Design a protein around this motif. Structure first.
Motif: not given
Lengths: 276, 276
Positions: A20, A32-36, A218-219, A221, B37, B39, B165, B167, B176, B214
């Motif tokens: 988003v 951006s996606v949070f968490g990967m 975290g973020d 992007h 991880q 989600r 964290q 977001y 997260q 997350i």
């Protein structure tokens, strides 16, 4: 068993499809996606991405400068807002203040100038890691953190940008990097290579074999201006990762030199120019 | 779209199949995997695990005690080595020293006793989070850390155990949690519920909707004595998560009370007794 760079490419595709619009401090929008998280094997291979040429000599030389604890920009060889907090004349002479590898080697020390003797001052996070690996390899606290230099003037007790955790089992050294934000186009490929290299170094001096590198964000992007080059990068097929060779026996982390390292079998796709 | 508890169960199964024997400080062996991880959606559901009954009132009451910044064991209602560093008579009276929520609310403050007035002392990490969410929801530094209390006597500048964290995007608050180690049998289910609850709380007072939780781990492990009960837990099918309801409008994080919260639609499998 699938090529690990496939994870990075899947993350890019996920951000392009499901990210988003989110604005960053620098104006510029991002997806951006949070968490990967991605996992890269270090066992007889080195995760230098192959879907574009990564400048590994720069990665190496910057890591060595970090390891030195240098705060002198001059010392960073050929291969931002924080500067506003500095004095004009010290800045001019290349003195960055207590930033980057100063934190790794003298965490919490009071900074005089870039030429001062800081031996014995502050916490040596990097030597603490190496020492713990030797004194208690089962330890769950083998952790080293880095701070974005712009944060140190802004507030009391700023959070780290990056938390790097090491782990030992069966004679293998693994590394997990948590990064509070990662730019997928430029930063991430560099960070992967950089911490993977650090892990190879530490493994070498502690007598372990590299295991896995786990990269957690975290973020996560993608800058708006990198969208089209990344779309093209996604169409490229990864090639087998290269190997990294350490060319002499080295005993202390401070003794490593840029010439101790060779990459072999590196067959990347062409360079992608991404504009910061 | 698959049930999120399926991730936790896949992690347990992964550790049972591919984890390696690793010893922990407490003698006891574990099966260990480094780097994982999961989600969990918080959108109209609350990830209180359903493959065994989780004691949510305990989770709630402990989180409230954390939020208070209390260091008084007496104050922790009905629902380890660190004690050795304390004086006998203060310990006897329930004074835990500068631990747990003291770090959340008075990080870096000098501790006198559990009854001292610490207003205005140290960094209030929790209020800093809430304040940043209101002043700059795009910020990548909305971070709060917790320390294992046993670490604070052991060394200068010990690493955190947990980095949480937050977001914000599109009116949704995500969280997260990075934990350097997690016990899959006991700790993890509790931590999930606990930080998911914190996220609901913070979202409520900032006018956002909960997004994702997350959960990221370093040394993800299963104690040897939990292997057989977890094997049995893996055979249970998750039920849809419950919902959490916050029952009045609350404006400050310190005003929440245990009675403000209700769970509904919670249909777990029976309790599993795991022995610490």
């Amino acid at each position: 068993p699938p090529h690990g760079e496939l994870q990075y490419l899947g993350q890019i595709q996920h951000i392009l499809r499901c990210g988003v619009r989110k604005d960053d401090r620098t104006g510029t929008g991002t997806l951006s996606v949070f968490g990967m998280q991605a996992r890269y094997s270090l066992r007889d291979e080195f995760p230098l991405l192959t879907t574009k040429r990564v400048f590994w000599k720069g990665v190496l030389e910057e890591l060595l400068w970090f390891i030195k604890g240098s705060t002198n920009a001059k010392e960073l060889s050929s291969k931002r807002d924080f500067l506003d907090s500095l004095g004009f004349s010290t800045r001019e002479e290349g003195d960055l203040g207590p930033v980057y590898g100063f934190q790794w080697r003298h965490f919490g020390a009071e900074y005089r100038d870039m030429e001062s003797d800081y031996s014995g001052q502050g916490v040596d996070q990097l030597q603490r890691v190496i020492d713990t690996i030797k004194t208690n390899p089962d330890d769950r606290r083998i952790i080293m953190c880095a701070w974005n230099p712009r944060d140190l003037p802004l507030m009391k007790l700023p959070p780290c940008h990056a938390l790097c955790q090491f782990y030992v089992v069966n004679s293998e050294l693994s590394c997990q990097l948590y990064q509070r934000s990662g730019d997928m186009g430029l930063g991430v490929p560099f960070n992967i290579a950089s911490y993977a290299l650090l892990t190879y170094m530490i493994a070498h001096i502690t007598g372990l074999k590299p295991g896995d590198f786990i990269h957690t964000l975290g973020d996560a992007h993608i800058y708006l201006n990198h969208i089209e080059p990344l779309k093209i990068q996604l169409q490229r097929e990864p090639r087998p990762f290269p190997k990294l060779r350490i060319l002499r026996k080295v005993e202390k982390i401070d003794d490593f030199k840029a010439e101790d390292f060779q990459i072999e079998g590196y067959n990347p796709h062409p360079t992608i120019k991404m504009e910061m």
